[model samples]
Target: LKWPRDLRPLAHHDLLYMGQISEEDRGDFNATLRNFLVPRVVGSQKHREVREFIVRSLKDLDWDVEEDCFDGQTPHGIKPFCNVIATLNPSACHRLVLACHYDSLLHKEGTFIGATDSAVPCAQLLYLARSLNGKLQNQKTRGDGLTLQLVFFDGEEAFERWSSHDSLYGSRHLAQKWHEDRTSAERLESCLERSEIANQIDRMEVMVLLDLLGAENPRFYSYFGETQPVYRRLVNIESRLNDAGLMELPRRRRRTNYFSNSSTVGFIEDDHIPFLKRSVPIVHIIPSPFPDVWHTLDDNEQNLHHPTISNLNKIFKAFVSEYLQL
Candidate 1:
């Protein structure tokens, strides 16, 4: 299959690995999604449960995991926010970050599963990490040669209302902390003999933020002009997957038609904002017009389209495989 001019051609091994990511992974993905669909408002037991599940899953895969816990004030009151960071190769200097928020909205009336808002994205991140685990372990075969980091942010939803001060609590904290750690000579020297780790964080390749996925008909466009090439690569991969008859055609056709490269795109207030403010390039993988069930009680597992989720799994698997050269 012909790839984009900017993108490299996939090897025979890469094609085999991409083909390995099949429908069999969907059951595991759906189960993780269901586990996270509880009343996961930050500081709640349900939120902790989801965090524990993520930590445990990464640990089970033998990935290095860290928890960024802090006290954050919301409109309601002070609440504890925890961000889960899992790394495939923690020692590698350069890294690629994949992130999603796990907290459900504070819906007082009824259950808000937030399946599309973020649950599915979190689950899909886990699946992607697992899919690339073996290849990441083999340094010689991995493409681009950057460490893979998966972050599950907490308190992304506004407790009272959407405000600059109220949302993105976990990401704001972690991004600042990382910046500080990178700047502090004592901290930087203590972690490593040299300043390589500090420079690595400063030179992060790209941070991909996923949200509002898994709906029946979803659309995503390049939100940042700086990351348009990265976004186009994903879109190109989906198109190739469709041409290869590996993707679900009807949904792929609908979704692929919606991948735009418009510079005049609207911005979303997500976890990537903090990193972006610090000069990190971001690829925001979210629907342009959010799903109808966004931030509402209707955003449950029932509203998610399984075929669409499967199609995304294939495209992402192929894209990551190509990017990593696995």
Candidate 2:
């Protein structure tokens, strides 16, 4: 899961579980990063560029990626934005979903980059798709097993300004889709029967969302929205990393940045909330301390820390391997 250059000792393995961006690719990615300095969020040109890049990358990996476009009113009035959904092993026994909000806050001026706010997690998801796609086939034995879906969401930022209806549009839509599909039991029944899986389509094992992963020695805490089982899984991940000499226990703190204690140790109102409402077991992995650059113009690539990405990557890889027996 570590970025190509960030994986220290593990890079030597022939499998190359770590995904690397070459000098050429990194330069191109950074160029795209720089373009974010222009005001961007829901419908900006820069936003479309990011979307296109994500789609191309997913397609390059042989994923059947879908760009779900819907009419929505941004502060700029009725504009179109997209949610990028890509899937691998869609018919597998267990389903695993990963998501990250791709939009930046709307208030920023030229080139906000929003690297720390989200790009890191977005990059990590791409890396994960490449690294883990091959192993998902192993889950077929469960009869009702596992698959992975990567979602890049839009409109997660405050619309005009912070308000009740302003955030999480993409996730809200997906959650509604899940709800609708469940209600229309025929679809769920058809899918289950087609896959010959024992569990209903709604019975996803878990949803892990990564957000705001751009800081040095990033500190992560269990969000208040997290279920006990999710918390235990995180704890087990931390333990495994420590045992592997990969990471220390991350510092835990009460969530104070977001007004609601929901960000603390239980539930949050971020992108994952809508899916959680649909009864998908969820975990929101937002780093604590939030970094000084959060939501600011300074949240550029320079604010990114190699160690933070490397460490989180290791933990995530370890967690998936342990649970899925990959």
Candidate 3:
């Protein structure tokens, strides 16, 4: 049978052991995460090293990287800021964006490794990129068309405290750009003149943001702010986890509020909001308890749990495979 031009399927191979973080590596990762990354925030030398480590890991996994820098005032009133945006597939029309912030807060006691807060997700992003890259190439071999984009956002962590305006700087900028291009009359007219760029934003299939996912006691609640269209996808993901023998129902029940959608319950000031505000459906896979060491000196590598990493990876991979029909 001939493959449809619209429907693409590469040989889907799920690798459960693409350098899974072992107990010893977790120890080393935790130590490096805590001792080095925690203390270094706000563009310090150590912070730069952490960023380098993330870049190196993604590159090793064969992802194309791009650093996006912007000038802005720091929390401490410093000027200028830099951000990194890495991409796995850039040419595909239907794109999936996975993002996490690599920046840590500027002021914290002792050190803030932010392992679960972000490092784990960043590492997972690399794995996902590699996995998707292989899949996309294989699909091309069989004449399948699809793409994935992994973005590492900076300034996602507040310089000091979490506020509506202060956090999610990078995402806010990107979302605002999309909004302008969509809403501005002149821009819209110009974009329409070029059919390729007119409906570009409409091509975005889904955006999944992972944060604080590597906790010892992890729980992912449905982000109530997500659009209803995508909520079905979230529910589908949950159901798939159940079918795959990896459902954590008790944890889900305990973490979810089922109350006000905007009642300040699970609504966090993360990077997803910027995209959500622009009507870009997003699912935030954040741990419920938020980890005991979250945003403090204690939130180091000691609390790194392999189960959490493995579980979240399973959920994410399952969702993508099912959604993309691969």
Candidate 4:
């Protein structure tokens, strides 16, 4: 995305913290990505292994973790699906959700390692949670009033073919359950009525869905026009980091445009669909023209671009830090 010509330089404090994201941070993120490269088709042995990894990682980081299990019928057959949810400040009334689907497509011909489709985004969320653990625990910014929830959804890919009834099994179930149980309260003395509590939980302040990242020469555009403000904030963060010499600007051939005009065609059908149906504002971060290796056997770790992953790691960390006003 291009930066505004009149944008100002980042402040000294911002520069200092930006430097805190060192090579070690990149290594941790890469390690997590590598760990999830197995064939993780929903309900498979590797799928359960990845789910366990996420649960154990969150526990290691001292966050409260919950597994939302439910039975859902998929094209493959009737099976159980598990959605892993990790929360920071669980008692907070409002929330900001960062979500990604973890299951890879059920390929019949060859192995499908969905490295960019979602593995990297899941690893990035884990790395962000670990990196900002202290700041999240000690601060109370305007954004802190809204708790952060990192969600890893399963059964997102279609087992047989992409259809309304086959895809997004986990997200569709979770959003429906939340909408139904919206009236449940965490604390009674907060003075908000049951219906208000339900509304707040139903409509999260923002739900950022990350997908199709970590590929070479990716082009991310704003899919939904309503989320332009949030998308612009992320773009501005990228610009400031570039100006501060913390990140390099993309070359002309690889430049990504985040601007979305009314004429922008095609809408993606992903996990965010369930939340959008409930009136939750969404920032969908999938690439416009999908990665070349999208659903092919080449969509493995071998095709992942380290530089792209590292740059996104820095951008997402900065965006979350600034969004929380840390």
Choose the strongest candidate by lDDT: 1
Higher-TM-score candidate of 2 and 3: 2
By lDDT: ranked, best first: 1, 4, 2, 3
Worst 10 residues of 3 by lDDT: 1-10
TM-score, per-candidate, Cα-based = 0.88, 0.75, 0.72, 0.87
In candidate 1, which residue pairs get closer than 3 Å at backbone N, Cα or C atoms, i.e. clash? 143-324
Clash counts for the predictions, in order: 1, 20, 4, 1
- Model 4: lDDT equals 0.75
lDDT of 1 by residue, 1-326 (tens): 22112457666556545744445676677777677767687888888988999999999988899998999878888899999999876655555688899998888787777888788998898888776678767752333335678889988898877989989999999888887764333432123233234533463567888899988667777878777777787777766665566655463444344355454448678999999998788988888788888778888888888878877877777777676566
For residues 256-318, write the lDDT of model 4, one tens digit per residue. 333233224778899999999987778887887889988888888888888677767767777
TM-score of 3: 0.72
The residue pairs in collision within model 4 are: 182-198
lDDT score for residue 131 of model 2: 59
- TM-score winner between 1 and 2, please give it: 1
Candidate number that wins on lDDT, 1 or 2: 1
Q: Write the per-residue lDDT of candidate 2 for residues 1-326, one digit (tens) a residue.
A: 21111112222231133223345534544454453434346777778988888898788877779897887765567767689988765545345678887888765465577886688778777766555566654553344435567888888887667565767777777767656653322333123333333233363556788888857755555554435445455565555444444442355431112212233543446887787666667777776666888877888777676555665665566555545556
lDDT at position 58, candidate 4: 87
lDDT of each: 0.75, 0.62, 0.58, 0.75
